[PDB]
Amino acid sequence: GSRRYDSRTTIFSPEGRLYQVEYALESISHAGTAIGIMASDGIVLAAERKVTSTLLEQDTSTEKLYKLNDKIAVAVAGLTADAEILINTARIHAQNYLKTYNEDIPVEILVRRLSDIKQGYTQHGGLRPFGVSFIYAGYDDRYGYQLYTSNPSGNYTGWKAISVGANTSAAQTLLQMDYKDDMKVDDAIELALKTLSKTTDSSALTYDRLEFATIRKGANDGEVYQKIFKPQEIKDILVKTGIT
């Protein structure tokens, strides 16, 4: 009947590799670059927009930096439509954990669940996996500042700075060169843009092609303040570092 049309996506190849996983990664190297630099007292998230025109509305726009709850944000690299389903079960799962324990969910648990959901899509069901990679940038009280990435495999690991999207080889080479561990949020701001000026496909880096975001311990009391920069604050930070 319909035996013929099956792609049989989920079987191994003779080498021991999952075909659909290897492709999804290649697809993800076409999406605009995203970079995370973790410092002692905060996290920077800078992502290079894709699609731009003098006729595109930019100020209200939001295509790569999404907020999950109070203290955790992500950056998307890949199919923005596919990701929008994985962002909605992340929020739901977060508040469901707040409903049952009365604590902000630990960063380790909210990562581990979105990787099980990715893994479970290559295990069975014959569906093509999501084409997404996340940079989970989050803060709990247990370990302080954390970074995580996941891949359409499911596998996830922690990083002090990492790149996904285009020129991850080129961007990862620069980042190893300049990273240091005494860094502060304002040095990391400077490094994240310095890496994006060199890897950019643009003839010149410009404020209207950036999505920028910090999570600082800074801000009143002990509480943590997440700040997705306005389009206008990015023009100021871009003259401050003197790239323009």
Partner: protein, 204 residues
């Protein structure tokens, strides 16, 4: 057994001139025996205030219920929910369990940001909207507040006069009731800031 008189409590809310006030007593009983005086009935999401009286366990469930829905709301639309909308939300959530209801009587109070119009609303068990321009009451001594408030109230009080009225209204009705007392908390909501005052009342 009365599913509402197990724990008691009373909540009262008043408008004034560009401000609102919502206040209650802090007792938590299990019929005769008094258990705790730390129990608060008033919670805030964003800048909207919700008082909930009745069966004590459904006060705790229905507070963590509404914190869930409004957090999700605040992440999508990127602004605290307004009081006018939030009132439809309370109502629809209750009626959703029409049969075997939550035994509660929520009260909304806040100031709508866009317009500056102060706003209060009341409820009952199933979930009808009591809309008033005066004052909303709720609880086991709701008969006593209705008569109390109506005599005192004068439309348009300034924020520091409103604080006197809603005190006399709540203090007298608690000592004429056998399920209220042990202090009281009164919030005064203005657009800029919120001022919370604990009351010294009798421990009989």
């Amino acid at each position: 057994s009365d599913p509402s008189s197990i724990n008691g409590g009373i909540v009262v809310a008043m408008t004034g001139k560009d401000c609102v006030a919502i206040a209650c007593d802090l007792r938590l009983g299990s019929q005769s025996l008094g258990v705790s005086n730390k129990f608060e009935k008033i919670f805030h999401y964003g800048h909207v205030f919700l008082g909930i009286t009745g069966l004590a366990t459904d006060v705790t469930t229905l507070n963590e219920m509404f914190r869930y829905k409004t957090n999700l709301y605040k992440l999508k639309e990127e602004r605290a929910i307004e009081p006018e909308t939030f009132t439809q939300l309370v109502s629809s959530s209750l009626y959703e369990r029409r049969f075997g209801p939550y035994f509660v009587g929520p009260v909304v109070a806040g100031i709508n940001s866009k317009s500056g119009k102060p706003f209060i609303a009341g409820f009952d068990l199933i979930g009808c909207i009591d809309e008033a321009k005066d004052f909303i009451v709720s609880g086991t001594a709701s008969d006593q507040l209705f008569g109390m408030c109506e005599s005192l109230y004068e439309p348009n009080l300034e924020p520091e006069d409103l604080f006197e009225t809603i005190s006399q209204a709540l203090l007298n009705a608690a000592d004429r009731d056998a399920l209220s007392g042990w202090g009281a908390v009164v919030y005064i909501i203005k657009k800029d800031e919120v001022v919370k005052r604990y009351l010294k009342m009798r421990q009989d």
